[PDB]
Design a protein around this ligand. Structure first.
Ligand SMILES: Nc1nc2c(ncn2[C@@H]2O[C@@H]3COP(=O)(O)O[C@H]4[C@@H](O)[C@H](n5cnc6c(=O)[nH]c(N)nc65)O[C@@H]4COP(=O)(O)O[C@H]3[C@H]2O)c(=O)[nH]1
Length: 137
C-alpha cells in the first residue's frame, strides 16, 4: 500500500519537489498532508481521487443523480450519519451502499454497520448535498 504522496506522484498530479516541500512543512506544522498539498495548488478532486483509490473506495464524481433510499437511511441515526460522515443511500446484491465524506472513517463506519457494505467517497459539497437530501432536519 502506497502513502498518499507516493500515490499522487505515481498519478502525475504532484511533482517530487511539491511533495518534498509539503512533507517538510508537515514535519514543521503537523497539518494533514492532503490539506497542505491542496493549499499549495493540488486540485481537491485530485486529492479525493487518490484518497479514494488508497482506501479502496469508489470516487463519486457527482451525488446529484442519487435518490437516497429511505430504507437504507434508517440503518444510521442522522446524528451518526453526520458525525461519521456516512450516508447510506441504497442496497445492491445484499450490500448497503454508503457514501463517505472522509476515507479515514471507512473502518469506523464499516464496524458500526456490521454488514456487507459498498463504500463511495464524495467531495465535501457533494457529500453535504446528499446528506441533507437523505436526512432532512
Ligand atoms: N480526509 C483526508 N485524509 C488525508 C489527507 N491527507 C492524508 N490523509 C489521509 O490520512 C492519513 C494520515 O495522513 P498524515 O497525517 O498527513 O500522515 C501521513 C504523512 O505524514 C506521511 N507521508 C504521507 N505521504 C507520504 C509520502 O509520500 N512520502 C513520505 N516520505 N511520507 C508520507 O505518512 C503518513 C501516513 O500516510 P497515509 O498512508 O497516506 O495516510 C493518510 C492518508 O490516508 C487529507 O487531506 N484529507
Amino acid at each position: 500500500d502506497l502513502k498518499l504522496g507516493e500515490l499522487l506522484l505515481q498519478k502525475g498530479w504532484i511533482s517530487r519537489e511539491a511533495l518534498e516541500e509539503a512533507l517538510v512543512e508537515e514535519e514543521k506544522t503537523g497539518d494533514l498532508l492532503g490539506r497542505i498539498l491542496v493549499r499549495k495548488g493540488l486540485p481537491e478532486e485530485a486529492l479525493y481521487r487518490a484518497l479514494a483509490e488508497q482506501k479502496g473506495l469508489e470516487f463519486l464524481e457527482s451525488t446529484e443523480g442519487i435518490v437516497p433510499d429511505p430504507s437504507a437511511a434508517l440503518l444510521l441515526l442522522r446524528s451518526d450519519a453526520l458525525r461519521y460522515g456516512a450516508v447510506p443511500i441504497g442496497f445492491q446484491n445484499g450490500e448497503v451502499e454508503v457514501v463517505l465524506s472522509d476515507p479515514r472513517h471507512k473502518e469506523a463506519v464499516a464496524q458500526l454497520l456490521n454488514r456487507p457494505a459498498r463504500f463511495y467517497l464524495a467531495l465535501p459539497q457533494a457529500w453535504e448535498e446528499l446528506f441533507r437530501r437523505a436526512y432532512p432536519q
